[PDB]
Amino acid sequence: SSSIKVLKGLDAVRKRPGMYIGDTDDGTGLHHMVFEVVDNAIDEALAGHCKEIIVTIHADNSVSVQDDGRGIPTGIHPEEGVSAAEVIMTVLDNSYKVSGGLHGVGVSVVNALSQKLELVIQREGKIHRQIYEHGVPQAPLAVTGETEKTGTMVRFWPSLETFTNVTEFEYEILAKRLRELSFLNSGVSIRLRDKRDGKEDHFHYE
Numbered sequence: 001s002s003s004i005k006v007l008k009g010l011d012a013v014r015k016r017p018g019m020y021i022g023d024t025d026d027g028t029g030l031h032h033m034v035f036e037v038v039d040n041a042i043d044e045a046l047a048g049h050c051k052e053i054i055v056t057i058h059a060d061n062s063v064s065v066q067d068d069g070r071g072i073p074t075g076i077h078p079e080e081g082v083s084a085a086e087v088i089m090t091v092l093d094n095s096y097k098v099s100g101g102l103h104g105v106g107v108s109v110v111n112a113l114s115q116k117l118e119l120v121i122q123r124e125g126k127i128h129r130q131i132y133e134h135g136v137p138q139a140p141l142a143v144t145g146e147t148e149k150t151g152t153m154v155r156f157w158p159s160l161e162t163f164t165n166v167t168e169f170e171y172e173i174l175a176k177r178l179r180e181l182s183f184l185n186s187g188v189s190i191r192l193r194d195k196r197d198g199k200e201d202h203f204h205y206e
């Protein structure tokens with residue numbers, strides 16, 4: 001079944017994480033987790049739908065990324081039987097890569113390597129929520145509210161089963177790369193907030 005296949009893939013990632021996200025011991029992989037989520041928001045911004053992306057480092061050492069784009073699609077596509085968002089979040093060598101030389105692997109890898117991940121989508125007048133634990137959804141994507149805003153928010157807590165040594169996000173690593181990303185995708189506003197020490201930055205080119 002999908003269930004079994006979905007779990008086999010999450011297990012493949014968990015078993016050889018470095019190969020998918022990058023080195024799990026020097027902070028390469030850990031920060032890549034953030035840039036992988038941001039990359040999909042960047043794509044939405046390059047297509048003209050998202051104007052601002054906000055990256056927040058929380059005091060519990062989770063990170064959220066939010067955008068003001070269209071929201072990830074919510075409907076159940078016939079042939080998978082779960083929301084399109086859930087397929088994106090669950091269906092699948094970076095080992096020795098360094099920094100910007102890493103290849104894009106998709107947000108399902110971030111999900112597999114997160115102790116917890118929350119997805120919130122504002123789309124078609126409605127707020128939708130799904131929670132995952134090491135990639136396994138708690139429940140099907142669900143409507144929790146009504147809204148006239150649109151956007152996508154991912155918050156994730158990196159698994160301490162995967163990441164060792166460098167386990168806390170370094171503001172400056174995120175600042176440096178997010179600044180480069182805003183330069184490399186002109187027009188897009190990126191904000192970085194650190195709730196640990198109140199640091200904030202706003203990167204934009206025009």
Ligand SMILES: C#CCOC(=O)NCc1ccc(-c2ccncc2)c2cc(NC(=O)NCC)ncc12
Pocket residue numbers: 037038040041044065066067069070071072073088107152153154
């Ligand atoms: C139906 C229809 C028209 O097309 C859309 O509405 N597209 C919105 C959309 C699609 C796919 C993705 C996506 C996400 C993750 N991996 C791969 C792709 C989208 C991602 C995002 N933003 C996003 O992932 N932000 C992180 C906080 N926004 C709209 C998306």
